Design a protein around this ligand. Structure first.
Ligand SMILES: O=C(O[C@@H]1Cc2c(O)cc(O)cc2O[C@@H]1c1cc(O)c(O)c(O)c1)c1cc(O)c(O)c(O)c1
Ligand SMILES: O=C(O[C@@H]1Cc2c(O)cc(O)cc2O[C@@H]1c1cc(O)c(O)c(O)c1)c1cc(O)c(O)c(O)c1
Ligand SMILES: OC[C@H]1O[C@H](O)[C@H](O)[C@@H](O)[C@@H]1O
Ligand SMILES: OC[C@H]1O[C@H](O)[C@H](O)[C@@H](O)[C@@H]1O
Lengths: 815, 815
């Protein structure tokens, strides 16, 4: 399209720049891909453009790292088992101001750049929110000029590709590297050894970890460009490699695969702890290789370790890299020969821990037997940490023996375990939650004892999302009508969106906000037709719930609402209702039986609703297959209504909520996580808040949740449960949904029925406002305008000043 | 050195070419390696030069393949489980005339190009002679302008790296891809399915192979440049990849490794059949993927299959890819629906088979049970082939029932097997041996029945070696003094070396031949000091036996000679003997117990000889560690005496023999393999021929080989066996060599003692000529001058005219 080339936020198509891009495109097609235009496929053209764009990062990448060596600022190490990066081509072009020049260059070559973008695989190296947070954070730390390094694992296979077959999830390997990764640089020269198993021998200089099995950690470095500041930071992802030296010779060569399995695949659990030894190996693999880099970099700066916390921050993304704490003590005590107490002073000042859930089944509690086998020196260090930590509890709270038992890093039971959250709190100078309500729940419930011992350690860092990927990239139409009014500074200063409240009565802005949403809906509707032969009504309200399938997120509450709408149509067919396309998408963890049953129920509801001729185009229910970062970038800008309906107290923050608010959907939600702060920023009058508050959930927990009461008092609810039970949604297998019905009626930890009536009434209010396009749009303006707090630049600026002790800067490096 | 830049055979350092090379060097250092000269290692500089040199192949690679599409010549497919390629940087620079320009460009950048060359790993994708033959053949087919495609497996791990520890072989994984391969191009877009297991269902159009397990075959294409003719052919090596679709999800992702193990490692057997199922999978993997390419290419030319043998040659390198014959029948009958008889006519005209040994333990004889499980349709096709083939035997030789049993593709016994050599002969229009004596032994012994049925099928193709790698690359000093006299045409017309017989009395040539050998000896001697702290006397005769460790090659006969020299010195210490450095090197197969004992004996002999102060510098015995193509390129040009001492009738050809002759060593050898033809070319007066002839070995076999007779009649031999037995060479473990002594005395299939006396007397004649430098050199001139037959260009020109039906051409493509 010649229309999108007119988008000012996409930069200049400089005549010389366009000439150079076409030359470098053709150059890579010949020398890099070894093709000519006679045999070249769209995939070859995507790769030729990716190599051409990647060449523009290299000078800035080298100069940034040289700049950090020269200036020696404090270095931030962001340790995560997940980096949910998504694609890279568009993000690179946006951050380097190349997007219009590449669009023009490709257009002149006879190519559609948008079609080339759709060839790139997502770097799907995460599960959901925590993984994407790490990705938004790398982007914001580069935009804020921080000497920041993402450290993780280069999984051969990311989050599984979800297919829907027979209305059921099927999992397939995410072979994201099949056609290579043009962004990464392999660094085999910087390969480091990681040790497993073995035994401790305590001798003449102290402890020595011996008889270990070695796994090599080969780093792959990916550029992380800041927004037009010429900063390019690094994401370093470790790949597992068998050691050089060693069933016979052949079997021994094949058995190299066992060590190399450590980086093979991402564990697909979202908010659920699976205590697999292989997962523990992945956690130690990242920590051990990463801390070797950190220590070497420290020593090669302007050994004495007193300055180490002035030169190093380690941020732990969940407890996944919690072993950083005992590993740093092991390195400082066993190898550097520091006194325990000095090493401990260093460790706590270096390390900080971010918590992302209060759900007990999500928290890591490793069996002591497994730690003793795999990491014997780490277990000895953990026990020593626990004794000295509990000595401090005993001195602060003398004779509080129950507090000692509650706070211990060691959990007693049939299987003795290490509580990794307790280890993180003991070994960290800062502990944060990820939304105001969540950080308050930590201090009141799960970490109350720790908060009482060291109140100064407990912080809030409300989550955010990068307005590069999540507005300029995915919704250039909206970014453009905003820039037409307030210029471009908001792209790295999102609080300037508040200027848009001046436009609530501006006829042109009201027109343009609605026209951009409609354009996004028409494009998404086209996609569903072209890639899946699925028809959707583009004059319908796009009602979207996209996130991992989890009982706490209550896709089932959405299911009850959808069936309510269906049943209300059947009872009063002649009565006008606002047409809806209800879209639900997300992956279930492969072992999660209830999650997989919930996907089948969504598709089953579709099978009835979407073929009832009385309903026709008034209601459609579609399960969006393979929800991932690239699909988020398509559906979120097309959404009218953002479903954020977690049981109050269960969603720590959410970030999908923020994406929807930034892209011109209105929110229906509970007072949970960051929904509370989004409502506060916009005004509650501009949010569809419903249901129990945290205090109400607790009152139910105090008297006991009886789902039967709701069933007995609510005829419309009774009708739906009877439909599920009797087989209305599974006629060939009438008892198919018995496990969902049994859970809802007798074992529902998330109180789905308790929010049913307020949810349905709230949804009526949504439909009422949608009937008034002008007032729907004015309320959208009030949401976009107040979305500025939810920039990850705001979040990271708080991490930098309140935890890391570094001052962010938006100032550009030279050219 | 500024001296080597003066070598005219290395081409011109054009001022613009040097400028462009430095620019592209710096460009790759920045954009490809993402380094600056502050952090750059010699390894980064090697890679920057390799990418710069590889860029010069690309235009010619694309134009050559386009040329073959346009001209549609008959295509030659050279199927091998082994491509022993060695390095690629120097070979590329030689074949493109870039060597002086790159040397000057690197010199101007402050770099030693020779030091950069030593960083490259060898592509060690073969065991020995057959693997290297495939490599020389690709080089010669490109130099002769043939539309030729090498097809094989991209082993992740090539021939194991040999370390010597405690004087014993140790094996380590050949991780040749650790730092990447800058020559290859991955072609994941051309990935093809290969089928295993399953079952046959015979239905309405005939047979269907169903319920199979799929392994994908991902091609990696490597350029093969001809000598200065602008031809760049392709070596396509298949990599195993798990199919896209499928213990739980995690285990299923890890279990992808099982399919991917097919291309993991080269089976390290030289001249020995190991009937491992994994090896059978590798063989079928290469054949099935390769034949899909061949069929697709055929159909996309200027379906009717009558023309297929006019457009396709398939050359089978040993029986390793013998399944090509039943696979082609399976494709033509089951998928293309040709009548059996028409398919068979096509198959036999397409296929030809090269044999490389008569040793029964080297020949492939697959259990029918294993073929029935892995390849049920292939076994059915083999049985059908066998019936029709034996019907023809019965009609040619009516009532010869023993001939039927002898010729059958099916071998009866405890375990019924398929004789893959019989399948190849039945399914091939040509069968060749690899030296005149070997091809005669095939027609007289092992394949006599087949020769009687179809005499026209049996050919000779005497082996050769490329005079690019094996003279211009490895011995530029010798290539230069030759070019100074006869110009450069000999480099692709090696029979012009006969012109050097005009120089047998030329004082300057005699001086220069000796000066080049001395330069090679000084350089190799330096290497042994620098890389292994090993001292060798450069005024000693360099006596070299380098080849795989095998009883038939009789490294043990060399061992007896070395101990004879030691014992003669000790008996008459004051008597002058020509000082020798006796070098033995080669790998033993990991399972081969006798081979591994023989390496230990060589190092054990060293431990005594090299520390006896009575001997000092008069005799040294060194085991050359990790003998491979790159080390062959160093030691062969430094050699005085080439040890080629196989039992007459056992070495099919040899090619190391040819390398030594071309590089100015004199040969001590039996009348075996190509040694016979080398002696014929040079005159027997210019070779140290000794020992039993094939006829003499047979007379011993007829009366029975009694090693005791030799022991009883030869006092010097008795003394050595008593030293081995008593522990003189293993004092801490006196019985260490009991297995060697027992084999020599009672179970020696290779008659080591029977050649002992003639071997020692022949070695005295070698020492006598070495005392006369002028006459040693004149005899060397007579050897180099007559080495021209042993060019692989001669060999391939014969394959092309006598088997493939294509006319070779030395004419250049444009620029
Ligand atoms: O369905 C269309 O795109 C798909 C949906 C979609 C979206 O919802 C938001 C977004 O940021 C990008 C986006 O790319 C999708 C897409 C898929 C392709 O296979 C493709 O070739 C392409 O150019 C793009 C489409 C149809 C159109 O008719 C059209 O003109 C167009 O530009 C695009
Ligand atoms: O031992 C020397 O080289 C090694 C042996 C050797 C050979 O025998 C033949 C040949 O084709 C090449 C060859 O490269 C070897 C070599 C090893 C290295 O590590 C290296 O850096 C190098 O430049 C080379 C050497 C010593 C020298 O003193 C010298 O000047 C020299 O140019 C080379
Ligand atoms: O903190 C980032 C994210 O981590 C986890 O996904 C939490 O469940 C989610 O609420 C949070 O927003
Ligand atoms: O034909 C190439 C080579 O194949 C095998 O290695 C044979 O043992 C050898 O004699 C021959 O020269």
């Amino acid at each position: 399209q010649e229309k999108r080339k007119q988008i000012s936020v996409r930069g200049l198509a400089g005549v010389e720049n366009v000439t150079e891009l076409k030359k470098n495109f053709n150059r890579h097609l010949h020398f890099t891909l070894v093709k000519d235009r006679n045999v070249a496929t769209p995939r070859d053209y995507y790769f030729a453009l990716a190599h051409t764009v990647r060449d523009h990062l290299v000078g800035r990448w080298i100069r940034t790292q040289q700049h950090y060596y020269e200036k020696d600022p404090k270095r931030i190490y962001y340790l995560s088992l997940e980096f949910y990066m998504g694609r890279t081509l568009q993000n690179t072009m946006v951050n380097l101001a190349l997007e219009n020049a590449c669009d023009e260059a490709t257009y002149q070559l006879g190519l559609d750049m948008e079609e080339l973008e759709e060839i790139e695989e997502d770097a799907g190296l995460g599960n959901g929110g925590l993984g994407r947070l790490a990705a938004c954070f790398l982007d914001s730390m580069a935009t804020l000029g921080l000497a920041a390094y993402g450290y993780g694992i280069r999984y051969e296979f990311g989050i599984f590709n979800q297919k829907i077959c027979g209305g059921w999830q099927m999992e397939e390997a995410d072979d994201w590297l099949r056609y290579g990764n043009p962004w990464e640089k392999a660094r085999p020269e910087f390969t480091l050894p990681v040790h497993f198993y073995g035994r401790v021998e305590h001798t003449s200089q102290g402890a020595k970890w011996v008889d270990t099995q070695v796994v090599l950690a080969m780093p792959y470095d990916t550029p992380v460009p800041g927004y037009r500041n010429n900063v390019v930071n690094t994401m370093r992802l470790w790949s597992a490699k068998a050691p050089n030296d060693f069933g016979g010779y052949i079997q021994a060569v094949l058995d190299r695969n066992l060590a190399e399995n450590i980086s093979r695949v991402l564990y697909p659990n979202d908010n659920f702890f699976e205590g697999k030894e292989l997962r523990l190996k992945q956690e130690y693999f990242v920590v051990a290789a990463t801390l070797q880099d950190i220590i070497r970099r420290f020593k090669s700066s302007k050994t004495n370790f007193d300055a180490f916390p002035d030169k190093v921050a380690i941020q732990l993304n969940d407890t996944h890299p919690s072993l950083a704490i005992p590993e740093l003590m092991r390195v400082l005590v066993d190898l550097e020969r520091l006194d325990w107490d000095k090493a401990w002073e260093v460790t706590v000042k270096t390390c900080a821990y971010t918590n992302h859930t209060v759900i007990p089944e999500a928290l890591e509690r490793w069996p002591v037997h497994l730690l003793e086998t795999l990491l014997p020196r780490h277990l000895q260090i953990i026990y020593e940490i626990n004794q000295r930590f509990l000595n401090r509890v005993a001195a602060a709270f003398p004779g509080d023996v129950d507090r000692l038992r509650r706070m211990s890093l060691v959990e007693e039971g049939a299987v003795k375990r290490i509580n990794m959250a307790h280890l993180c709190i003991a070994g960290s100078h800062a502990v944060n939650g990820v939304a105001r309500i969540h950080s308050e729940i930590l201090k009141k419930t799960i970490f109350k004892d720790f908060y009482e011992l060291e109140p100064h350690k407990f912080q809030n860092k409300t989550n955010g999302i990068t307005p590069r990927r999540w507005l300029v990239l995915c919704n250039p139409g909206l970014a453009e009508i905003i820039a037409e009014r307030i210029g471009e500074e908001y792209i790295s200063d999102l609080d300037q969106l508040r200027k848009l409240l001046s436009y609530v009565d501006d006829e042109a802005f009201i027109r343009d906000v609605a026209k951009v949403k409609q354009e996004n809906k028409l494009k998404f509707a086209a996609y569903l037709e072209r890639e899946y032969k699925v028809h959707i009504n583009p004059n319908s309200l796009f009602d979207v719930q996209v996130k991992r399938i989890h009982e706490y997120k209550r896709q089932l509450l959405n299911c009850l609402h959808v069936i309510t709408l269906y049943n209300r149509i059947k009872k009063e067919p002649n009565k006008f209702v606002v047409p809806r396309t209800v879209m639900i998408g997300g992956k279930a963890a492969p072992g999660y039986h209830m999650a997989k049953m919930i996907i089948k129920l969504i598709t089953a509801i579709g099978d009835v609703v979407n073929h009832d001729p009385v309903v026709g185009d008034r209601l459609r229910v579609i399960f969006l297959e393979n929800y991932r970062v690239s699909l988020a970038e398509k559906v979120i800008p097309a959404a009218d209504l953002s479903e954020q309906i977690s049981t109050a107290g269960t969603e720590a923050s959410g970030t999908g909520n923020m994406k929807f608010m930034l892209n011109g959907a209105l929110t229906i939600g509970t007072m949970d996580g960051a929904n509370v702060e989004m409502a506060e920023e916009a005004g509650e009058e501009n949010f569809f808040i419903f249901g129990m508050r945290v205090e109400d959930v607790d009152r139910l927990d105090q008297r006991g949740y009886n789902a039967q009461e709701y069933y007995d008092r609510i005829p419309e609810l009774r009708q739906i449960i009877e439909q599920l039970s009797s087989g209305f949604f599974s006629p060939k297998q009438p008892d198919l949904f018995k496990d969902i019905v049994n859970m809802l009626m007798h074992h529902d930890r998330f109180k789905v029925f308790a929010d049913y009536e307020e949810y349905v009434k709230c949804q009526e209010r949504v439909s009422a406002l949608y009937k008034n396009p002008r007032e729907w749009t004015r309320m959208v303006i009030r949401n976009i305008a107040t979305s500025g707090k939810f920039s990850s630049d705001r979040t990271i600026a708080q991490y930098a000043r309140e935890i890391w002790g570094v001052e962010p800067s938006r100032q550009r490096l030279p050219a």
